[PDB]
From a paper:
The cytochrome P450 (CYP) enzymes found on the membrane of the endoplasmic reticulum are a superfamily of heme-containing monooxygenases involved in the biotransformation of drugs and other xenobiotics. CYP2B6 shares at least 75% amino acid sequence identity with other members of the subfamily, constitutes up to 10% of the functional CYP enzymes in human liver, and is responsible for the metabolism of 10–12% of all drugs currently available on the market. CYP2B6 is the major catalyst of efavirenz oxidation and conversion to the most abundant metabolite 8-hydroxyefavirenz, which is then glucuronidated. CYP2B6 also plays an important role in the bioactivation of many procarcinogens and environmental toxicants such as polychlorinated biphenyls, chlorpyrifos, and polybrominated diphenyl ethers.
The CYP2B6 used for expression, purification, structure determination and any other work in this study includes engineered mutations Y226H and K262R in the N-terminally truncated and modified construct with a His-tag at the C-terminus. Because of the relatively low-affinity binding of efavirenz itself, the 2-desoxo-2-methyl analog that demonstrated high-affinity binding (KS = 0.21 ± 0.06 μM) was used for the structural studies reported here. The 2-desoxo-2-methyl analog contains a methyl group in place of the carbonyl oxygen in efavirenz. Interestingly, the chlorine of the efavirenz analog 2-desoxo-2-methyl (abbreviated as I for convenience) forms a π bond with F108 in a similar fashion to that illustrated in our recent study using monoterpenes. The orientation of the methyl group towards the heme-iron corroborates the putative metabolic transformation at the oxazinone ring shown more recently by Cox and Bumpus. The trifluoro group was located near the I101 and F115 side chains, whereas the cyclopropyl group was placed between the side chains of F206 and T302. The CYP2B6-I structure adopted a closed conformation that is similar to the α-pinene complex. The phenyl ring of F297 rotates ~90° to make room for the chloro group of the analog. The F297 side chain is pushed away by more than 2 Å, in contrast to the amlodipine complex, and is likely to accommodate the chlorine group of I that is involved in the π-interactions with the F108 aromatic ring. And observed in the current structure, the R262 side chain may play a crucial role in hydrogen bonding with neighboring helices, which could impact the enzyme structure and function.
Author numbering: 28 to 277, 279 to 491
The structure:
């Protein structure tokens, strides 16, 4: 009837000396073997409760939704955010920010374009730039970032940036580096001992300087918007929000500038670096499994044809591609420990008691890798999402977007980018590398808050 069991901690160090040099996750995986699906680890001074397996995670996020809906914090970025912006917002600030953030994808501008259409145009620009490389080896990183970021900017600032633009390439670089520093080994140790490390040089200081610098750009852009603002013809997200700041009198209110900047920062960042990451991994996987690429190509050829651009409508008619995409995300396993939650009350769980405000990780990646749902789960295989006839077999253990109240509000957009971008690129190209399939190493560089694929060279060969 106490906190869940786990390794016995030491005062001032916690469970430091039972961890696993590999990582926070590899550590937690070892503990799971000993203590089962629900257990307690002391990350430095605090207890944090781990939940593993799809049954436990659903039980928490869905069945006990009200209790498990709070947001914890990530030590590396907390000094920057400190509770502002939808990702790290709690209580009413979150209720407000979330509602707003959702109803501004799901509610699109009267005259302005569709979400699909924004993506469909991007994809073109992209193919019209892959051709302009005339088949050269390149690192796709900067481009995969470029296309996903332009989808947000489109909604947020009402516009896009050119792939060969400088200030733009500098920004996307601040994102990439920040995300990787958070996912770094220091970044993990920082989770454990931020209290002490705060006072010394290290990545945390860079992640701050980066966040400040992006936020500065957003800030200026907000100022520019406020000047040219038209009360009865809003251009984008920013305009919409500036018009809710119509609530200047109503007295104690959640639409601060701090929220504006921080919220936007929050979206850009999440919407840019996670899809881009998935795509990046997608194409590495295609290099290692050309048979899959070819079989996806065939379906595109057999359902869409070689000319007309793919569209969302086609998705129903083409299961193999969908299954491949699902498998990419499942295997990409982008947010292994999800993002930290907290319990909003003294909370009863499988006979244990988790006190109000205890941090709770939902080890999402124990779901995606459950052997009971995926034969040989360590291995990349589209079959995982197909029945006996090659029809799409959805499964309730596929939760890369988490569940319940906090669940990704980009799911719609992401699943649309992954489909359109993937199939459009493949429609017009085929993949080549100097490296052989047998020799392609999938092992990530960085494996922390986020799984970051190893850095690779690829070429795009017109079809
Ligand atoms: C395949 C790509 C993506 C994956 C795997 C993914 C995954 C996740 C996960 C695991 C969470 C936290 C779940 C939890 O709270 O327990 C989350 C939340 C969030 N995602 Fe995504 N995401 C993706 C793409 C996107 C996109 C396209 C956007 C659009 C802006 C986005 C914006 C957000 C935001 C703002 C949150 C915080 C939601 C909240 O706390 O209320 N993400 N996502
Ligand atoms: C789902 C979510 N979105 C997000 C948004 C902003 C910031 Cl600073 C960090 C994140 C965060 C992330 C991420 C991966 C790099 C894209 C994080 F790191 F805080 F956990 O995850
Ligand atoms: O508040 C905790 C004080 C002790 C911190 C010392 C550890 C800091 C992280 C690396 C190993 C030593």
């Amino acid at each position: 009837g106490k906190l869940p069991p786990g390794p016995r901690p030491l005062p001032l160090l916690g469970n430091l000396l039972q961890m696993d040099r590999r990582g926070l996750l590899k550590s937690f995986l070892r503990f799971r073997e000993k203590y089962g699906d629900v257990f307690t680890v002391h990350l430095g001074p605090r207890p944090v409760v781990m939940l593993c397996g799809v049954e436990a995670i659903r039980e928490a996020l869905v069945d006990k939704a009200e209790a498990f809906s709070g947001r914890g914090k990530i030590a590396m970025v907390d000094p920057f955010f400190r509770g502002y912006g939808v990702i790290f917002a709690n209580g009413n600030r979150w209720k407000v920010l979330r509602r707003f953030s959702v109803t501004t994808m799901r509610d699109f501008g009267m005259g302005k374009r569709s979400v699909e259409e924004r993506i469909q145009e991007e994809a073109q620009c992209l193919i019209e730039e892959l051709r302009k490389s005339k088949g050269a080896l390149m690192d796709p990183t900067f481009l995969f970032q470029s296309i996903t970021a332009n989808i947000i900017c489109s909604i947020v600032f009402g516009k896009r940036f050119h792939y060969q633009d400088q200030e733009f390439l500098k920004m996307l670089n601040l994102f990439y580096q920040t995300f990787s520093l958070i996912s770094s080994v220091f970044g993990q140790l920082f989770e454990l001992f931020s209290g002490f490390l705060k006072h010394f040089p290290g990545a945390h200081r860079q992640v701050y300087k980066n966040l400040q610098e992006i936020n500065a750009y957003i800030g200026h852009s907000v100022e520019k918007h406020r000047e040219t603002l038209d009360p009865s013809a809003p251009r984008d997200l920013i305009d919409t929000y500036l018009l809710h700041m119509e609530k200047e009198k109503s007295a104690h209110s959640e639409f601060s500038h701090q929220n504006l900047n921080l919220n936007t920062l929050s979206l850009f960042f999440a919407g840019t670096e996670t899809t881009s990451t998935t795509l990046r991994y997608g194409f590495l996987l295609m290099l290692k499994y050309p048979h899959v690429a070819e079989r996806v190509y065939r379906e595109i050829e057999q359902v869409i044809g070689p000319h007309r651009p793919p569209e969302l409508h086609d998705r129903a008619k083409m299961p193999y591609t969908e299954a491949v995409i699902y498998e990419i995300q499942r295997f990409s396993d982008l947010l292994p420990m999800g993002v930290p939650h907290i319990v909003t009350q003294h909370t009863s769980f499988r006979g244990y008691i988790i006190p109000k405000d205890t941090e709770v990780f939902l080890i999402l990646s124990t779901a995606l890798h459950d052997p009971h749902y995926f034969e040989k789960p360590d291995a990349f295989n589209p079959d995982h999402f197909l029945d006996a006839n090659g029809a799409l077999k959805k499964t309730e253990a596929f939760i890369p977007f988490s569940l319940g109240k906090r669940i990704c509000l980009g799911e719609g957009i992401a699943r649309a980018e992954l489909f359109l971008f993937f199939t459009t690129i493949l429609q017009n190209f085929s993949m080549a590398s100097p490296v052989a399939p047998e020799d392609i190493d999938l092992t990530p560089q960085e494996c922390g808050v986020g799984k970051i694929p190893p850095t690779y060279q690829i070429r795009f060969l017109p079809r």
